[PDB]
Design a protein around this ligand. Structure first.
Ligand SMILES: CC(C)CCC[C@@H](C)[C@H]1CC[C@H]2[C@@H]3CC=C4C[C@@H](O)CC[C@]4(C)[C@H]3CC[C@]12C
Ligand SMILES: CC(C)CCC[C@@H](C)[C@H]1CC[C@H]2[C@@H]3CC=C4C[C@@H](O)CC[C@]4(C)[C@H]3CC[C@]12C
Ligand SMILES: CC(C)CCC[C@@H](C)[C@H]1CC[C@H]2[C@@H]3CC=C4C[C@@H](O)CC[C@]4(C)[C@H]3CC[C@]12C
Ligand SMILES: CC(C)CCC[C@@H](C)[C@H]1CC[C@H]2[C@@H]3CC=C4C[C@@H](O)CC[C@]4(C)[C@H]3CC[C@]12C
Ligand SMILES: CC(C)CCC[C@@H](C)[C@H]1CC[C@H]2[C@@H]3CC=C4C[C@@H](O)CC[C@]4(C)[C@H]3CC[C@]12C
Ligand SMILES: [Cl-]
Ligand code: NA
Length: 544
């Protein structure tokens, strides 16, 4: 029957740019092995339980993020508002990764891939072919004067034209701005047309990324130096765990790949029927998502090991410890691959297919949720379409700050602060806090038992009550006690203003929870304690 195999292909995609592009870069920046220990702890202690929580709240209440929270606990409706703010910021920068992929795809159509060789305008006199780096280039006859990879030069110089600092915004790169518009135009048209159902080709869309990843994985494993990369990736370095960043990055990557804390999962749960075994699906899909990231990591690290031994440099220093590692490692593998142009086109098409799907869903979700806040006004037939255009246009302009020559720096701030980090922990802690301690985890378990058919094991409630709170709060405090500034590629120190601006992006979402609480307390009438009590009590969430 293969009912199980059918649902995964049809349900929420278990691959995204977070698997292919966010996970490898965060791992690498944090050491290969160490990152994995907090990552798996978070996956089982917070990630999977929160994922299931969001799906079931949505299923129990039959409502999306903003409205579901109001039913479960009225005073905590701010969690839904915060999720919308986080989604709005994510949509602005997630599409920038796609604009880079589109640029690489246009570049790919040439007979010779630009990143493959070094005789080009962007290339510095330092750049040397990687085969040459080991052979007579590095401290052999003339000592290596900081020689660099053609692929790295293409990314930093042709694609990014990286400025010295966020302080120099530089010129708007017209080519990346046009690529961003193309990605945005596709997004608007698919959302406006309402092209959300692709029953016949959903299979190709699901299979294509996995097939491409398998080819990349085989290429890497067959590449000399793969074992060293796999060891770097697999073997943990404990000293790293003593740093707050590895924990925050690992736990948050779990939250990122899962789309938890964005209000997407509550909405997906709402679509599910009341009597559905969502618990089985959440476990399968969450494990598959994490499994994809874990396996993709083998591919990328085997290539990094190869690059490290060709160049003759440490695996840690071979490629960027920043967003853009995928743009260096995977393109290099393609060059090694026979018929490179063909593989490059496929990889960037895959990157595009994974990202676009996610972006369409996220932007539709943002727009729908925003329309729902004021439905009568925004349900006029023209007005919804105008709203979609407005959201797409405003997000495109903000994205323009990131397609400038100093825009990579702005992108790193957005990736670190806007939809990841303390903001995700804050929303997750609150979702777990309210369900576990206000609504009552056991009370939810009565409802889950009715919906799923069987009472769930003690793991979900313990995670909501203790493990997720302790992991989220502990990581937040640890980061503050041992504070380390965001640094781009390990060598760039962000100005103090930039860190404050990044904090504001994190804070805007975070502040929504306390601010709404205050608004609710004021609006309700009565003695303070009575107000709090009424606001705490659930508004008929069973909806039988
Ligand atoms: C998300 C939106 C609404 C608010 C945040 C926008 C931030 C992240 C973006 C938008 C414009 C960007 C700025 C663009 C131009 C400048 C002036 C320059 O001399 C220093 C960099 C600086 C100051 C950038 C910092 C990052 C920046 C402020
Ligand atoms: C805004 C809508 C119409 C989409 C526009 C897309 C077009 C006009 C943009 C987006 C990506 C751009 C390309 C990006 C890469 C290259 C390869 C380079 O060696 C020559 C320029 C060229 C060929 C650019 C030409 C203009 C371009 C194709
Ligand atoms: C609706 C609102 C948020 C749109 C805001 C668009 C802003 C964030 C984007 C769009 C166009 C961008 C500008 C394009 C060109 C320049 C000239 C350059 O010498 C300084 C940076 C600057 C000034 C960019 C700053 C960021 C910028 C102003
Ligand atoms: C929502 C509640 C918990 C407020 C939390 C605010 C805390 C966690 C945030 C908000 C603003 C942040 C500060 C913003 C700017 C700077 C200057 C620089 O030296 C980095 C640290 C520091 C000092 C940040 C530390 C953490 C910070 C103080
Ligand atoms: C409870 C009912 C009345 C809904 C109230 C929603 C209000 C209180 C919430 C929802 C969205 C929230 C806003 C979302 C955007 C931002 C980010 C930054 O620019 C300042 C805070 C601010 C402005 C928030 C303030 C509080 C806010 C306006
Ligand atoms: Cl992940
Ligand atoms: Na994706």
């Amino acid at each position: 029957s293969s009912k199980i195999d059918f649902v995964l292909s049809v349900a929420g995609g278990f691959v995204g740019l977070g698997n292919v592009w966010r996970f490898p870069y965060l791992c690498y920046k944090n050491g290969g092995g160490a990152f994995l220990i907090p990552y798996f702890i978070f996956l089982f202690g917070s990630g999977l339980p929160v994922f299931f929580l969001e799906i079931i709240i949505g299923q129990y209440t039959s409502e999306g993020g903003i409205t579901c929270w109001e039913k479960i606990c009225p005073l905590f409706s701010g969690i839904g508002y915060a999720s919308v703010v986080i989604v709005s910021l994510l949509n602005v920068y997630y599409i920038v990764i796609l604009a880079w992929a589109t640029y690489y795809l246009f570049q790919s159509f040439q007979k010779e891939l630009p990143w493959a060789h070094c005789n080009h305008s962007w290339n510095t006199p330092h750049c040397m072919e990687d085969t040459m780096r080991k052979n007579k280039s590095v401290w052999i006859t003339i000592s290596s004067t900081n020689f660099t990879s053609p692929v790295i030069e293409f990314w930093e110089r042709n694609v990014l034209s990286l400025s010295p600092g966020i302080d120099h915004p530089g010129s708007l790169k017209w080519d990346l701005a046009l690529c961003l518009l193309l990605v945005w135009l596709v997004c608007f048209f698919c959302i406006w047309k309402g092209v959300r159902s692709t029953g016949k080709v959903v299979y190709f869309t699901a299979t294509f990324p996995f097939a491409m990843l398998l080819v990349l994985l085989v290429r890497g494993l067959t590449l000399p130096g793969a074992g060293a990369g796999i060891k770097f990736y697999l073997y943990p370095d404990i000293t790293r765990l003593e740093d707050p960043q590895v924990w925050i990055d690992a736990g948050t990557q779990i939250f990122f790949s899962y789309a938890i804390c964005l209000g997407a999962m509550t909405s997906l749960g709402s679509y599910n029927k009341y009597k559905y075994n969502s618990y089985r699906d959440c476990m399968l899909l969450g494990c598959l998502n994490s499994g994809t990231s874990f396996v993709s990591g083998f591919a990328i690290f085997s290539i990094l090991g190869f690059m490290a031994q060709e160049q003759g440099v440490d695996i840690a220093d071979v490629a960027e410890s920043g967003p853009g590692l995928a743009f260096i490692a995977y393109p290099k593998a393609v060059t090694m691959m026979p018929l490179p142009t063909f593989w490059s086109i496929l990889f960037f098409i895959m990157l595009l297919l994974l990202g676009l799907d996610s972006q369409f869903v996220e932007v539709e979700g943002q727009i729908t949720s925003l329309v729902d806040l004021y439905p009568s006004f925004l349900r006029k037939g023209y007005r919804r379409e105008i709203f979609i255009a407005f959201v797409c246009s405003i997000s495109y302009l903000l994205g323009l700050t990131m397609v400038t020559e100093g825009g990579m720096y702005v992108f790193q701030l957005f990736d670190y602060y806007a939809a990841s980090g303390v903001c995700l922990l804050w929303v997750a802690f609150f979702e777990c806090f309210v369900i576990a301690w206000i609504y009552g985890g056991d009370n939810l378990y009565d409802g889950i038992e009715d919906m799923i058919g069987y009472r769930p094991g003690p793991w979900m409630k313990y995670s909501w009550a203790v493990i997720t709170p302790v992991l989220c709060v502990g990581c937040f405090i640890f980061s503050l006690v041992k504070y380390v500034p965001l640094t781009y590629n390990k060598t760039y120190v962000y100005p103090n203003w930039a860190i404050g601006l990044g904090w504001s992006l994190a804070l805007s979402s975070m502040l929504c929870v306390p601010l709404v609480i205050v608004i609710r307390l004021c609006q309700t009438e009565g003695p303070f304690l009575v107000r709090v009590k009424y606001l705490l009590t659930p508004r008929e969430p069973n909806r039988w």
